[PDB]
Amino acid sequence: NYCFAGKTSSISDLKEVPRKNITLIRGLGVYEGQVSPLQVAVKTLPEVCSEQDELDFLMEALIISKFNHQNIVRCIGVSLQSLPRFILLELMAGGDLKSFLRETRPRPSLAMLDLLHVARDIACGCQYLEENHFIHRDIAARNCLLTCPGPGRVAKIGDFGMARDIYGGCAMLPVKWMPPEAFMEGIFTSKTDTWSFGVLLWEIFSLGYMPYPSKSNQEVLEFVTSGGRMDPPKNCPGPVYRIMTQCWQHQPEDRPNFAIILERIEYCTQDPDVINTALPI
Numbered sequence: 364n365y366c367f368a369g370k371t372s373s374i375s376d377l378k379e380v381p382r383k384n385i386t387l388i389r390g391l392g393v394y395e396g397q398v399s400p401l402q403v404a405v406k407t408l409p410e411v412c413s414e415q416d417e418l419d420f421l422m423e424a425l426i427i428s429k430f431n432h433q434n435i436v437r438c439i440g441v442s443l444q445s446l447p448r449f450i451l452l453e454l455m456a457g458g459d460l461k462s463f464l465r466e467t468r469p470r471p472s473l474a475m476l477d478l479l480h481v482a483r484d485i486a487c488g489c490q491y492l493e494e495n496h497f498i499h500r501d502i503a504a505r506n507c508l509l510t511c512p513g514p515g516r517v518a519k520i521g522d523f524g525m526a527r528d529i530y531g532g533c534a535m536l537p538v539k540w541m542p543p544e545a546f547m548e549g550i551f552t553s554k555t556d557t558w559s560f561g562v563l564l565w566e567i568f569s570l571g572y573m574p575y576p577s578k579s580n581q582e583v584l585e586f587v588t589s590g591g592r593m594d595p596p597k598n599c600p601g602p603v604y605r606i607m608t609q610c611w612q613h614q615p616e617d618r619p620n621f622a623i624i625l626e627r628i629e630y631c632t633q634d635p636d637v638i639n640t641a642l643p644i
């Protein structure tokens with residue numbers, strides 16, 4: 364039983380796709396697949412798994428199935444009555460955002476406006492999550508996906524494993540994306556995702572760098588709790604960096620909600636001095 368948006372659902376509400384209709388085409392590093400012919404991504408549950416994994420896999424399907432928003436990956440259905448169990452998801456040809464940013468770093472293509480559109484897309488999905496009282500807890504470039512690599516790309520939130528687990532360790536907590544009250548006190552609110560979004564904004568405008576580059580998790584923990592924050596990414600416009608620093612306010616109630624983040628991102632897309640800024644090679 365999973366609840367969201369004022370309703371409660373169960374494994375039954377999911378759309379079971381008969382296994383015979385599903386064909387795997389590739390590994391994606393998850394598989395590309397066909398459903399008879401719709402092209403999909405296939406998330407597989409290892410047959411070698413515990414019964415916690417089973418519950419976890421099922422809950423992720425229910426979670427994703429109850430979102431209806433263009434910046435959140437669609438769930439096409441499931442194939443749970445055959446082994447290995449499948450979740451069928453929208454196919455995102457552009458791949459994960461972190462890799463796209465690294466592979467697409469300008470070299471001897473990408474402009475500031477393109478980064479702002481990615482930021483806006485994800486902020487729009489986060490707003491929808493906040494409006495529906497869903498806390499993602501793991502907003503980060505590695506969990507975002509792009510429809511296509513070329514122009515006209517749309518970014519969407521593509522993984523919900525963290526929200527499903529707390530619905531798995533200290534050395535596995537995404538400490539570099541978390542605000543103080545989250546890694547000190549275990550408190551998670553919509554303002555937790557606001558902080559993380561600021562880190563994601565830094566990943567975007569650094570073009571896929573690891574946050575707090577030369578620091579370890581514990582060092583970041585002590586840095587952040589002492590009031591330290593990352594410097595601007597190379598060539599980052601001040602209006603964009605100002606969004607990051609607002610997201611990283613020490614007190615959650617001093618951080619903006621996603622309606623205001625979106626507002627400020629759109630104001631950035633309007634500033635020639637911002638969108639005419641050159642990205643570093």
Ligand SMILES: Cc1cc(-c2cccnc2)[nH]n1
Nearest residue numbers: 391404452453454455458459
């Ligand atoms: C859920 C999902 C994952 C993907 C994907 C990942 C990496 C490369 N290409 C596509 N598309 N859809």
